Write a protein that binds this ligand. Structure first.
Ligand SMILES: *[C@@H]1O[C@H](CO)[C@@H](O[C@@H]2O[C@H](CO)[C@@H](O[C@@H]3O[C@H](CO)[C@@H](O)[C@H](O)[C@@H]3O)[C@H](O)[C@H]2NC(C)=O)[C@H](O)[C@H]1NC(C)=O
Ligand SMILES: *[C@@H]1O[C@H](CO)[C@@H](O[C@@H]2O[C@H](CO)[C@@H](O[C@@H]3O[C@H](CO)[C@@H](O)[C@H](O)[C@@H]3O)[C@H](O)[C@H]2NC(C)=O)[C@H](O)[C@H]1NC(C)=O
Ligand SMILES: *[C@@H]1O[C@H](CO)[C@@H](O)[C@H](O)[C@H]1NC(C)=O
Ligand SMILES: *[C@@H]1O[C@H](CO)[C@@H](O)[C@H](O)[C@H]1NC(C)=O
Ligand SMILES: *[C@@H]1O[C@H](CO)[C@@H](O)[C@H](O)[C@H]1NC(C)=O
Ligand SMILES: *[C@@H]1O[C@H](CO)[C@@H](O)[C@H](O)[C@H]1NC(C)=O
Ligand SMILES: *[C@@H]1O[C@H](CO)[C@@H](O)[C@H](O)[C@H]1NC(C)=O
Ligand SMILES: *[C@@H]1O[C@H](CO)[C@@H](O)[C@H](O)[C@H]1NC(C)=O
Ligand SMILES: *[C@H]1O[C@H](CO)[C@@H](O)[C@H](O)[C@@H]1O
Ligand SMILES: *[C@H]1O[C@H](CO)[C@@H](O)[C@H](O)[C@@H]1O
Ligand SMILES: [Cu+2]
Ligand SMILES: [Cu+2]
Ligand SMILES: [Cu+2]
Ligand SMILES: [Cu+2]
Lengths: 371, 371
């Protein structure tokens, strides 16, 4: 049988998670015959990628970072690459894709279409990778995603000493304080050391409490990607126990999505805010520009995975479950999201698509499972 | 001497307000010499306009509702008139002009530039009118702004019986419930009965709790202006006592602007939400499209007046006082508004202008006082 209450023990909570995942795997695989068992893709933990498989993915990303942008220049003047096309649409729609009813599904579609670009333009034929926070929550620096080696998404940034805390303001609420991490500057190694971040900053939190906001975040501001790896953040918000609490203690989609994102006032930023902010730097600390950090795709692989596990714990009730509205924290108010709500990624990839077609990983345009 | 504590008595609170206003008038007039006593314009209560003066203003508005729109068609396809130019920019910027640091100053500049259009394109040579809520708080229908006569901003809409309540959601907070008023449909008389509302709805609250949101609120949706005059709303939020509480019990700009707008969770929508929602209808109940209702300009004349009174109670401390950020309720987070923050009305009128130049009615582009 499955666990119903999350343990505080790291070792078991991991295996607790593993059981819940296998269950989710079972329901998904044996429910599939569009999507069939034959063309069912499997998304996999980055650790499970052999060296060359890691590099294949990385090279496909680098490829999208070389191919020219399709976005009409006058709409995103700072866009240069196909990768920017994805970053631009995210910055463009930030206000309607976080703390909305569409949060989970939009991101699921976002990473899927990113994947399609890798496959259709950059010859990627491997599996979509995800970053399992829990395994790295004691040492982010040793994460295979962030260790600075040739198979990381680059690693830490130039150490900058004595930086002030990050002070996160969700609305008018009291700030959540976070340490500045052990980096600060440009990433010093790894495949993306010469990657040029072109857009933003739109809302970049700085050590000290400041925030940098370009006049127009879609205009040209070429600079390095910065990181400040911050283990304390992961161990505060992204441990296996926190992951399993999120899954086991959320009886509806509202509680799920809110707990995952961090409910304002609780002093908590969830596994989702945890994973983003643990990267530090730029656009690591910019809610709008975050896809500009290459780790984003793996992070959201894991977000999608966690959502998919949760859905399968109760597929009758949860598969199509939606809650929230079309505006960030419903500010200003907007209508409830419904199964007919249409989302899109502008010029990044794919076309407009209704929520109903996004709710399942093995329906609509989707045919994948997480291992 | 001035009152420091608001009375609960309507008669005195009115005169309490009158004293505070004369004081504000005194400080403003005798501080002026750009702006001098010579070219100092006076803005006046609508009741103080003689019949022909009322009509002159109305005709100038009707004029802007006939002259063709300047907004690049591809940016606001639904725009037809110079009046739409103003409505379009408001819908366009709603998310950064309410519950922001720029709320008060942006609107002050917005109505000033509207006034400039009336004068420069529609030969208006009279005074800017404002709507004093307090005097009408017992019978909105008898308001000279809304009595349906030829000198109103049109009046009530076709009565629609048995409409459900309005259910206002500020974020995730519990709904504030309001009665549906005594209208519902198209305005039945007055100068604007054949006025065609072209934009929205963007976020239109409906009796019953529903909300109508066009896919693109800047596209073409020509329809009548609707109203449902609702006295109970004015007497709940816009009485002379409520006005004087707002002015006397707000010791800083944050408290002022928040109390005026209604702080979320308090079950109160302030004199500002009160004045808007008392109109009912469409775009009366649409925070984005509200300038589409012609009364908007008078309402915000009074908003500006109330702010101006408050500033002059303590001109040393309050004249340049700013608080808040660049995003609706700071969702998502943005940097603090500062005196260097630039605002603009797109294609409506005027150019970009910094907050510092908006803080005083007798500095920057401004040279007016309220009587
Ligand atoms: C609503 O607000 C947005 C944001 O301010 C406005 O977007 C702005 O649109 C204008 C016109 O497209 C852009 O100006 C520039 O015009 C020149 C032509 O002279 C063109 O070559 C440029 O590439 C660009 O189009 C401006 O970049 C853009 N601003 C931002 C920050 O995106 C929009 O106009 C507003 N909508 C309405 C109806 O006013
Ligand atoms: C960010 O989001 C906004 C809102 O979706 C996007 O605005 C959209 O811009 C496109 C392109 O200008 C508009 O499409 C239309 O294109 C035809 C040409 O085929 C033109 O004739 C039309 O007048 C119009 O320009 C579309 O109306 C507009 N959508 C809305 C709701 O405003 C914007 O493209 C996004 N920015 C980025 C970088 O993706
Ligand atoms: C998944 O299915 C397999 C194969 O039938 C079964 O052995 C295993 O116990 C299942 N796991 C869970 C958690 O249900
Ligand atoms: C922004 O303003 C608030 C109060 O108005 C202040 O407490 C806060 O520290 C400011 N933030 C920064 C980084 O200036
Ligand atoms: C943050 O903003 C404050 C206020 O302008 C400024 O004094 C300080 O230099 C800034 N800190 C840094 C170094 O980013
Ligand atoms: C305004 O100034 C006039 C003229 O000096 C004075 O008579 C009046 O008392 C003043 N009103 C207030 C409230 O200060
Ligand atoms: C929107 O959804 C919430 C709960 O998800 C519900 O309570 C509310 O009544 C809905 N509003 C409308 C008008 O459908
Ligand atoms: C409001 O929305 C609900 C849910 O779709 C619908 O059943 C009802 O007809 C709507 N009410 C009206 C008449 O606007
Ligand atoms: C197991 O290790 C985790 C970190 O991965 C801790 O959070 C937990 O308390 C236990 O020590
Ligand atoms: C004076 O009248 C006002 C309405 O204008 C009331 O709110 C007040 O209680 C007093 O009766
Ligand atoms: Cu996102
Ligand atoms: Cu994210
Ligand atoms: Cu407004
Ligand atoms: Cu208003």
């Amino acid at each position: 049988t499955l666990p119903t209450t999350a343990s505080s023990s790291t070792a078991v909570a991991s295996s607790q998670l593993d059981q819940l995942a296998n269950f989710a795997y079972n329901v998904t695989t044996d429910s599939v015959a569009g999507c069939t068992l034959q063309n069912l893709r499997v998304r996999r933990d980055w650790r499970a990628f052999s060296k060359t498989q890691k590099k294949d993915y990385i090279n496909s990303v680098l490829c999208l970072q070389k191919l020219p942008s399709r976005t009409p220049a006058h709409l995103a003047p700072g866009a240069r690459t196909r990768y920017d096309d994805f970053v631009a649409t995210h910055i463009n729609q930030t206000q309607i894709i976080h703390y909305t009813g569409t949060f989970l599904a939009w991101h699921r579609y976002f990473i899927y279409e990113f994947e399609q670009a890798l496959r259709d333009e950059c010859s990627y034929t491997g599996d979509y990778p995800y970053w399992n926070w829990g395994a790295d929550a004691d040492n982010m620096e040793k994460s295979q995603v962030f260790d600075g080696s040739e198979t990381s998404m680059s690693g830490n940034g130039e150490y900058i000493p004595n930086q002030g805390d990050i002070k996160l303001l969700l609305g008018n609420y009291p700030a959540i304080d976070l340490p500045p991490g052990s980096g600060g500057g440009c990433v010093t190694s790894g495949p993306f050391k010469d990657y040029k971040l072109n857009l933003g900053p739109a809302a970049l939190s700085l050590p000290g409490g400041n925030m940098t906001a370009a006049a127009n975040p879609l205009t040209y501001n070429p600079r390095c990607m910065k990181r400040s790896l911050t283990t304390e953040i992961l161990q505060r918000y992204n441990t296996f126990p926190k992951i399993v609490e999120l899954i086991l203690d959320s009886d509806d989609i509202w509680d799920f999505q809110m707990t995952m994102q961090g409910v304002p006032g609780s002093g908590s930023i969830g596994v989702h805010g945890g994973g983003h902010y643990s990267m530090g730097g730029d656009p690591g600390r910019d809610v709008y520009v975050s896809p500009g950090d290459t780790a984003f795709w793996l992070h959201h692989g894991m977000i999608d995975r966690v959502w998919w596990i949760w859905q399968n714990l109760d597929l009758r009730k949860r598969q199509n479950a939606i809650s929230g509205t079309g505006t960030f924290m419903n500010n200003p108010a907007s209508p409830n999201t419904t199964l007919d709500t249409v989302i899109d990624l502008g010029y990044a990839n794919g076309g407009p698509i209704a929520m109903r077609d996004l709710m399942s990983t093995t329906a609509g345009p989707f045919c994948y499972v997480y291992l």
